[PDB]
Amino acid sequence: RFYKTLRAEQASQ
Amino acid sequence: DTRPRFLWQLKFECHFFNGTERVRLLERCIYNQEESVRFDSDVGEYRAVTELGRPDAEYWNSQKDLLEQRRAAVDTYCRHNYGVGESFTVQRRVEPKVTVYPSKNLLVCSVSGFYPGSIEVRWFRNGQEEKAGVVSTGLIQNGDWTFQTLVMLETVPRSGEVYTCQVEHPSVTSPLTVEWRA
Amino acid sequence: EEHVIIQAEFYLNPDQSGEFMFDFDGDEIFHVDMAKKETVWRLEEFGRFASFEAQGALANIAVDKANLEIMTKRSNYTPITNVPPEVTVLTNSPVELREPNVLICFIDKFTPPVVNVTWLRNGKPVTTGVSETVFLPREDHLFRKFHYLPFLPSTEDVYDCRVEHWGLDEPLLKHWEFDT
Numbered sequence A: 001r002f003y004k005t006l007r008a009e010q011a012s013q
Numbered sequence B: 001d002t003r004p005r006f007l008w009q010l011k012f013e014c015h016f017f018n019g020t021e022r023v024r025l026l027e028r029c030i031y032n033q034e035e036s037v038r039f040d041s042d043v044g045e046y047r048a049v050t051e052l053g054r055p056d057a058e059y060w061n062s063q064k065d066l067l068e069q070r071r072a073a074v075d076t077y078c079r080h081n082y083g084v085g086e087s088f089t090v091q092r093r094v095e096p097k098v099t100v101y102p103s104k105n106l107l108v109c110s111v112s113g114f115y116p117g118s119i120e121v122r123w124f125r126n127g128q129e130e131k132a133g134v135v136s137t138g139l140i141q142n143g144d145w146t147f148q149t150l151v152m153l154e155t156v157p158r159s160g161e162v163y164t165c166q167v168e169h170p171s172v173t174s175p176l177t178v179e180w181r182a
Numbered sequence C: 001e002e003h004v005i006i007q008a009e010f011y012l013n014p015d016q017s018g019e020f021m022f023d024f025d026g027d028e029i030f031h032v033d034m035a036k037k038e039t040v041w042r043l044e045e046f047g048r049f050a051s052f053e054a055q056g057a058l059a060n061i062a063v064d065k066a067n068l069e070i071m072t073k074r075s076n077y078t079p080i081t082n083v084p085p086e087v088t089v090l091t092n093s094p095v096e097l098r099e100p101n102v103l104i105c106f107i108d109k110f111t112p113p114v115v116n117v118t119w120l121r122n123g124k125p126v127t128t129g130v131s132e133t134v135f136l137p138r139e140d141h142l143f144r145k146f147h148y149l150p151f152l153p154s155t156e157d158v159y160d161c162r163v164e165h166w167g168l169d170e171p172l173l174k175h176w177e178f179d180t
């Protein structure tokens, strides 16, 4: 089975 | 090197209680050494920890797909990733190597190369448990998926006296016993 | 609780050094090599029972770099205060003469995640047989790291762990030698 990556989110510019 | 440094850390912590019965996700953003913002699955929304985190908690909470995706992550990510490695993580069992030796007066019980960290070490003097004068180094994680512990007994051994170190661990069916005669 | 799985990533400027790794109860499952752009499993066994797609990990790092640059400006260029490390030298098991063992250099409670660790065998640097871990996370948001030296316990040998960190004025030298 594959380990999942939780996607980083772009911060307030 | 004297030039200034700027560090950014992102952490997703999946906390599991009673297997995968209760699960908690903790998304933490850390600027330098101060955590600024976070998503706790028990709360359901982004919360600013410092003033620096306030634009982000506000920005990320305004994105419904984010809050939708992150509210479900305890199942899609936490419960998934736990199953992915259960056989070699949760189910990993490495039997400890138990050794009794005197180190002056102290009697040392070395318990090494075991997995998981959940261990019980009991000292005995002529078949009777000696709880007092017992000092441990605590659980030492060696960074290679093994632990070690040193459980000392403050004692000046008299001749004929038999000391016993009893170790209990998930790896073994019955306790490991190591004897030492003075 | 019972267990904790951590996806920990960092980006550091001006060094331009990033990191992506997975932790199970404190122990690294794997990390992504940023240069080679591939998954490095802590134990080979892990690579035989589980898989990973590193581009997801490298995409996260691009965002961390981007967010570090936003936070750097936002904080009016407030830099990291160097926290020097707590160094401890220990063995993997009780030491016996001529019985192979491993010397561990545990570098703990430090930031930023940049150290020079050198093993010295009788004053001279031993650059062969050595291994290390990545910068492992802590709850205080500082790092821990381990450096290993497989050795053969001797009466005629002395070892030292030399740690250099920007939070330290001079290198920290931690000694080990066989007793009795």
Ligand SMILES: *[C@@H]1O[C@H](CO)[C@@H](O)[C@H](O)[C@H]1NC(C)=O
Residues within 6 Å of the ligand: B001, C114, C115, C116, C164, C165, C166
């Ligand atoms: C590591 O070694 C180099 C050698 O020139 C030195 O300049 C650098 O500052 C060192 N890094 C740390 C973190 O001490």
